[PDB]
Symmetry: C2
Subunit: 397 residues, 2 copies
Amino acid sequence: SEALLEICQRRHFLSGSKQQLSRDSLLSGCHPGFGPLGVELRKNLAAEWWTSVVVFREQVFPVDALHHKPGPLLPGDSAFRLVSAETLREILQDKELSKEQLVTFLENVLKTSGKLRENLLHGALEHYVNCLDLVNKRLPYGLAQIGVCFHPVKSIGEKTEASLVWFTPPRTSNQWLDFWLRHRLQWWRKFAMSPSNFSSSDCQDEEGRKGNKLYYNFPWGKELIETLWNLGDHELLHMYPGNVSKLHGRDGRKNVVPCVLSVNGDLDRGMLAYLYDSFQRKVLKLHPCLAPIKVALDVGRGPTLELRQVCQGLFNELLENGISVWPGYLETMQSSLEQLYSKYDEMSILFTVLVTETTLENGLIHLRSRDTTMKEMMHISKLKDFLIKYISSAKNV
Amino acid sequence: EALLEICQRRHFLSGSKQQLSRDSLLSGCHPGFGPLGVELRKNLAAEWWTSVVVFREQVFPVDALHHKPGPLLPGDSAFRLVSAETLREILQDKELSKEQLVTFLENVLKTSGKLRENLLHGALEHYVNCLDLVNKRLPYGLAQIGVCFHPVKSIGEKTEASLVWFTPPRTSNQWLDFWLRHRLQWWRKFAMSPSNFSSSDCQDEEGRKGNKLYYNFPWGKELIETLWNLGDHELLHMYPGNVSKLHGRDGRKNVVPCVLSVNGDLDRGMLAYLYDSFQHRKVLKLHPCLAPIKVALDVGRGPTLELRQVCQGLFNELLENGISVWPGYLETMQSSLEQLYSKYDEMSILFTVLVTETTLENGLIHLRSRDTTMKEMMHISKLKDFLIKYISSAKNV
C-alpha cells in the first residue's frame, strides 16, 4: 500500500472522496474526475504526445469526429443507447395500447438509437477518403485525434485516448508498425524515472494479424496503457464498399489500397502511471516537461506591497514565455519554509524562487530545487532564460 | 454558397453539400470538421484560453465528466443513457409483461444517466473542493472548453468554452460588466467587420440579468455566447443546508459567492469567422492568429532534391517556432503559380514563400502575400523573425 493517492488528493491532482477514488474506480474511468493539477498534468502530456507524432513530421493531420455513433446499429452491441429523454415522457402518456404499443416501441429503440464511441478509429477511417485528397494521394499519412471515449465496466467509464491512424501500404505496413512501437515505447520512457517499468509485448488476431501492447508496472503489477495494431485493408474496405479505386493512394508509380495501422494510448492511465512513477519527505519528481506548475514563488523578509511588486513582474515575466508560475506570494504568514517547501514537493513543482528585500538592494533572488534540493543564489533577471533552458533541456536529454 | 463550397474543397467543413447545410451547421448537427476546420477551431480555443485563463491566477482548469450518473430529476429535455442489458430482459424474454411495462419507462428517467447539456453544473461540483486552493479567496474562476449535447429526435454536439466566475455579491454586478466588455472585445479583435459582433442586455432566469453576444451572419444575427449572473441561487441549491462550507473571503468578510457563468459557442464562432473573412478574387482573410496554416512554401525555377532539402530547413526552423507551414515542396505537376496562388488564398495561408535557384546560389528567397497581395525580397534567414513579428503584432492590437 502507498499514500500517494493521499498527497494527490490534498494537492488537487486527483479529485473526489476517498471512496469514489477507488483503485478499480481510477483504472475503469469511473473516478469523479481530475483536479486542476491533474488537468494541467494531462494537458501537458496531451501536448507532448502531440508534438511527438503530429507536429514533428507533419504528414499527420488533426481530424474531428463525433462523440456518438448515430443512426441504426447492428443486433446487439451491448453498449448503452442514447434515448432522447423527452421521448420517454411522451410515452408515459398517449395510453396508445398501454400494453402492446409500449412493448413494440422498445424494439425500435434497440434498433434505431445511437451510442457513444468506443474508440477514435472509426471516426478516423470515416475521414480517409476526404483526407486522402489533402495529400495529392500519396501515402503514408496519418490522422491524429485525442479525445474522450466511453467504455462500459452497469456503469460507464470515461477515458481520454490519443489516437493515430497510419495509412501505409502493405509493403512498408508491417515495417511501420515496428517504427511506431519503438516511437511510442521510447516516448513513454522519455519522461519516466524508472523507464524500466514501461514494457512492450507481442500478440495477434483481433481485427487483423500483428499487434503489440505497452504496459506500465503499477506497484501491484503491469497494466495496459497503449496498444498497437496492423488491421490491414479490412475495415477500410468494409467501411468503403464500392469502387476500390476510390480508396488507395500511391506507393510509387502504382496505386494500392493502404493498410490501416492503429496506435492508441490511454492518457488518463498514462497520467496515473506518471504520478506513481514519481513517488515511492513526501515529494513528486514529475519530469520537468510534465510538471503541472514549473515554479512557485513567494515573498520574504522585507516590506510587503514593495516586495510583491516584482513578483507580478515575474509571474507575468515567466508567463509571457510559457512558464507556469504558482503565485503563492498572495497567502499569509511565512508558513515556515519547511512547511512551504515540503508542500511544493507534493505539488511536484520544479523550483521555488523567493523574493526578499535583499533582492531589491542588488538584483538577486534564490531558487531552490526539487531534486538537487540546493538553496542556490540567483540573479533575478537571468531566471527566465534559465528556466527556458533547464526545461527545454530536460526535454532533449 | 461560394464560401461553403470553398470551405469544402479547401478542407474546412467535411461532408456532402447536403448534410453540410445551413441548418445542420448551426444546429451543430453536422458530419464533422476537416483538418483546416479542426485547426481553426483549435486556435480559436487556444486563443480563448490565454485571453481568460493563462493570466490572473484565480482561474483554474477544471475537468467535468461527459455524463452524470446516479439518480436524476425525472422529466425535462436531455439525453438519457439507457442500458440494453436492462432493456433486453424484457423484449426477447417476455418477462411477464402484460400488466407491468410502465415501471421501466418510469424507473428509467430516474435510474438513467444523462449526457451533459452544459459545463456549468460540472464546475459548481468543484467549487467547494477548489476553494481550499486559494484560501477561500473570491473571486476565482473555473475554466473549461468542451462538448455538450443538445437535442435538435436528433442529437447535437457543440464545443463549448465556459468560465464560471465565483464572486462576492458586493461586486457581482461589477464583474458581469467586465466580462461582457472583455469577451466582446475578444471576438471583435479577430474580426474583419467587428461591426457584425454585437452585445445586448436582458434578464429573468435562475438569477436575473445577463448579456448575450451575436454575430451578424449574412442571413441575420445569431447567438454565439451568453454571460449570466445566476447569483447565489445555483450554488445554494447545489448544497442545501451545509452553507458554512461555502463562505468565500471578501477582504475580512465571509460570504457566499455569486455564480457568474460565461458560455460561448466555439463552433459557431469558427463559422462566424469563416464568413467574416470571405465577402476569382475569393480568398478567406482569416485573422493571423486564427488562420489554420500561417505559411506555405514550395520550390520553383531550379533543381529538386537540392532545392527541396532547403525547404525542410525552414519547415523545421519554422515548426520549431510554432509557425504552421504548408509542405508544398513535395508536389508533382506544376499546374501553374496562379492556380496555386489562388489555391492557397482559399486555405487562407498568410504568406507563400518560394525557394528557388535564385536563392540557393546566394541566399534570397521570394515570398508573396494574401492581404496586400505584395511580393518583396527577403533573406531566407529573416522570414521567421518577420513572421513571428507579424503575428506577435497583429495579435496584440
